[PDB]
């Protein structure tokens, strides 16, 4: 009762098992005193007691979970770490009851905010996949990794058996495909999430879990297998998966330099040679414009949509894979998952019908059995296609080379055609670059730095951070001076289109020009569009419009349009 | 009664957050200030999601315990001056109001109630209708209008705060040797400062901030705002003042200074307001006027 053990007295487990030793009153009181003495006293090398600084922020966020690193608990009072690894279900009860004392020392009457606090363990120093688990692991703490395959809804559950409840949710976890050995199927396990941990993860995420490994009787398993076979589950204890002023100043430094637009385009898709216009269009789509709306009868999207007609093997699928790794959020082939992101299509009636609705709208609506509901698309579409068989025909307009309705070609902001042209010098350049890249990739720090800086003019980590910063912070606008010239150019282009008997230029093209100019302003972190932005946007759209036409019309257009496609 | 902005309407959290005194005491224009407020409510034992509930519907127990909770906690934040006594009125079953809340409702109704000479005449005529929109609210039979006044007061303080943070974070205050100068060249909507009372509310925000930010240099301050229709700056000259808790009064000397520069100057200017500390001047003439002003010994 009154007397307490020394820490050295705990070195000898005196009962027949660990659990029956931890649960004794004098041992338990000793452990409680020692844990409280650790939590009030552990330090950085700089002093600066970390847990006194964490409890402080627990109340600043009105939170419920205190987080403890295992390495700190192993760095002093090692026996408590050993007992925690062996008997988590007991040790964590004592530790939670100590954590409440420590928090009330900062914030008296915190019990009125939350009645009970949970300790979360981090950095447990050994890991298993779902292969290595065996019966010896039962009731031990484990650390596991995988992909979350399926998730239930959240429900309340009765806490005690006057009443009290807690939140509950189950998650199915599967081995990551990179970990699975060759020629074997992946394994599965199911995880239980309680009060603070529900909806911490989403289906398809790759996730890391710490918790107790636990089992129970199940009648159906016994009945079907015909042997006394128990079922097992994991009870999670913790689950795992911005910028400074220095980054902002660095971004602004590079943006202040001349030619930053060209350098960003050059950094785009380093492994692919040539095809600068495709890289330009992809960069413009990833940065995008600004959305606008006028409740008097009109709305304008900020997203930029691009379509690429590809000869066989002209790098299309590689740049889509590159964009998939570059972009913040994306879908590859579902438009709900592409919300405020980029959507990627590499090959191609109901699918096309869905895309017809998606290009007309920015939000999707559906009804079924009298139910009615709505969803958001709000995304930029990058698509590629094979031109109606083995090879494109340049003598014909674009419609002859595609399996698309006319409004699709109207509503795509940018159209482009890529062809396997014949040139000895280009072939030699391609072949030299290809074998050079092949050698540079061979499995057989300084080597990496040289390789990286030869690969690109911008480090791509900085470029991804820069794209995210620009997308979240920069919102450009037009300047009202040169817009008279834009209107005159629009009228001139329409007059020339009619004069040669071309299909006419339209308001959609003018809108696309303004949107692309906004994107060009965003690329250099400029809140103003400028004359050169309008010039570049005009060149892109005019050249794209010219590429869609028949050959005789193409010659008349380029002869007249020389003062836009090349001059300004 | 508490020097908290409209306590018995909106919520307890908003009462602290928009208080003109609290902003000077805890520096709420930045996150290192806002976190102090979260920290306070956590120590006081009030769950933060209840502090944001509408004060009428907030739980009865907190309502009656609040008077003791403040005695135990405001000292640790240097914030004891919040406590004071005031007058409260109630009529039948429709609930209490204090005089401090009432005057904010009336002033809000004055501010926002609903070539160059004609536009100035239209504006000055619109401002006179609000006198009757406030006069008719002094009648117990017309509480409906008073509630509208309160709804307008909240939006006015919101818009003021969202301009004050921009002034401080971009460091637009220019620290001249004799006085402090600030000029608003642009804003989210700069029209709200075209009325004198709104301009004085913004000035009174900045003055508390300047009074508490350093112990040194109690200085006069000048504040100005441009108008795109007149191309004239509306200018006001403001005194310092001593903190709440601390002995003759000081006097506003901008009157004689503006009068003397007006008597001397080439500049195109207007002086017709009852409060002579407020003047108006055309766009190009602001800098020579202020140059002659700072060159003068009258400041």
């Amino acid at each position: 009762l009154r007397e307490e053990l020394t820490l050295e007295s705990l070195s000898n487990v005196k009962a027949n098992s660990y659990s029956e030793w931890i649960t004794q009153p004098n041992v338990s009181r000793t452990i409680a005193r020692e844990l409280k003495s650790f939590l009030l006293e552990y330090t950085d090398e700089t002093g600066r007691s970390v847990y006194g600084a964490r409890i402080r922020t627990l109340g600043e966020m009105n939170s419920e979970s205190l987080e403890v690193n295992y390495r700190h608990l192993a760095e002093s009072k090692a026996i408590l770490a050993l007992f925690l690894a062996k008997c988590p279900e007991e040790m964590l009860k004592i530790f939670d009851l100590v954590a409440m004392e420590a928090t009330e020392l900062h914030y008296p009457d915190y019990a009125r905010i939350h009645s009970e606090i949970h300790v979360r363990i981090s950095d447990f120093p050994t890991i298993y996949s779902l292969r290595e688990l065996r019966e010896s692991n039962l009731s031990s703490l484990v650390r596991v990794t995988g992909v979350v395959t399926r998730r239930t809804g959240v429900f309340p559950q009765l806490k005690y058996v006057k009443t009290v409840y807690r939140n509950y949710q189950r998650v199915t976890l599967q081995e990551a495909p990179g970990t699975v050995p060759p020629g074997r199927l992946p394994r599965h396990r199911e995880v239980i999430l309680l009060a603070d941990l529900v909806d911490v993860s989403k289906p398809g995420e790759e996730v890391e879990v710490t918790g107790i490994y636990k089992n129970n009787y199940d009648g159906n398993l016994n009945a079907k297998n015909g042997f006394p076979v128990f079922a097992t589950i994991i009870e999670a204890n913790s689950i795992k998966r911005s910028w400074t002023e220095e980054e902002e100043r660095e971004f602004r430094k590079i943006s202040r330099d001349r030619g930053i637009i060209d350098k960003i385009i050059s950094s785009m898709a380093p492994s692919i040679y040539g095809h600068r216009d495709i890289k330009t269009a992809v960069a413009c789509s990833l940065f995008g414009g600004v959305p606008k709306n006028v409740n008097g009868k009109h709305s304008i999207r900020g997203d930029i949509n691009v379509l690429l007609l590809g000869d066989p093997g002209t790098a299309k699928s590689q740049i889509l894979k590159y964009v998939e790794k570059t972009a913040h959020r994306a879908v590859f082939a579902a438009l709900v998952l592409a919300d405020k992101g980029v959507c990627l299509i590499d090959e191609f009636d109901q699918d096309r019908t869905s895309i017809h609705e998606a290009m007309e709208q920015q939000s999707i609506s559906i009804s079924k059995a009298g139910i009615v509901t709505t969803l958001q698309a709000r995304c930029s579409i990058i698509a590629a296609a094979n031109p109606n068989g083995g090879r494109y025909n340049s003598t014909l307009p674009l419609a002859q080379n595609v399996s698309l309705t006319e409004p699709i070609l109207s509503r795509f902001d940018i159209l482009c055609v890529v062809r396997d042209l014949v040139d000895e010098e280009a072939d030699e350049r391609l072949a030299t670059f290809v074998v050079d890249s092949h050698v540079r990739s061979h499995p057989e720090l300084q080597r990496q730095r040289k390789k990286e800086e030869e690969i690109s003019p911008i480090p791509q980590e900085l470029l991804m951070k820069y794209i995210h910063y620009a997308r979240t912070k920069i919102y450009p606008k037009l300047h009202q001076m040169d817009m008279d010239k834009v209107s005159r150019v629009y009228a001139d282009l329409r007059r020339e289109s009619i004069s040669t008997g071309s299909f006419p230029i339209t308001v959609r093209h003018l809108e696309s020009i303004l949107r692309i100019a906004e994107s060009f302003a965003k690329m250099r972190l400029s809140e103003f569009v400028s004359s050169y932005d309008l010039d570049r946007a005009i060149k892109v759209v005019v050249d794209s419009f010219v590429d869609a036409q028949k050959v005789s019309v193409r010659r008349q257009l380029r002869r007249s349009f020389a003062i836009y496609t090349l001059g300004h | 009664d508490y020097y908290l902005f409209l306590l018995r309407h909106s919520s307890l959290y908003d009462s602290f957050y928009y208080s003109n005194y609290v902003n000077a005491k805890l520096s709420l224009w930045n996150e290192n200030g806002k976190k102090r407020l979260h920290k306070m409510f956590a120590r006081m034992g009030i769950p933060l999601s209840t502090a944001q509930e509408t004060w009428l519907y907030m739980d009865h127990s907190i309502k009656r315990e609040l008077g003791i909770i403040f005695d135990k906690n405001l000292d640790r934040y240097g914030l004891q001056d919040i406590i004071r006594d005031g007058f409260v009125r109630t009529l039948g079953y429709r609930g209490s109001i204090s005089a401090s809340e009432f005057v904010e409702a009336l002033t809000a109704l004055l501010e926002v109630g609903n070539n160059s000479a004609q536009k100035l005449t239209n504006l000055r005529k619109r401002w006179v209708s609000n006198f009757w929109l406030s006069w008719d609210a002094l009648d117990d039979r017309k509480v409906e209008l008073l509630n509208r006044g309160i709804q307008l007061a909240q939006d006015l303080q919101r818009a003021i705060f969202n301009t004050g943070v921009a002034i401080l974070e971009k460091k637009l205050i220019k620290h001249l040797r004799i006085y402090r100068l600030c000029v608003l060249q642009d804003g989210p909507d700069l029209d709200l400062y075209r009325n004198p009372l709104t301009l004085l509310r913004l000035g009174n925000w900045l003055i508390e901030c300047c009074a508490e930010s350093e112990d040194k240099q109690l200085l006069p301050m000048v504040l100005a705002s441009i108008d795109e229709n007149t191309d004239t700056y509306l200018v006001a000259g403001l005194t310092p003042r001593y903190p709440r808790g601390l002995k003759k009064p000081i006097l506003n000397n901008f009157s004689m200074a503006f009068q003397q520069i007006t008597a001397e100057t080439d500049a195109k200017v207007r002086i017709d307001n009852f409060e002579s500390s407020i003047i108006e001047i055309r766009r190009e003439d602001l800098s020579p006027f202020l140059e002659k002003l700072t060159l003068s010994g009258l400041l």
Partner: peptide, 17 residues
């Protein structure tokens, strides 16, 4: 107690700052 002073210092810095 001197060893636990760093904890109480982190608590008191809320008073100071």
């Amino acid at each position: 107690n001197p060893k636990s002073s760093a904890f109480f210092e982190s608590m008191v810095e809320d008073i100071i700052e």
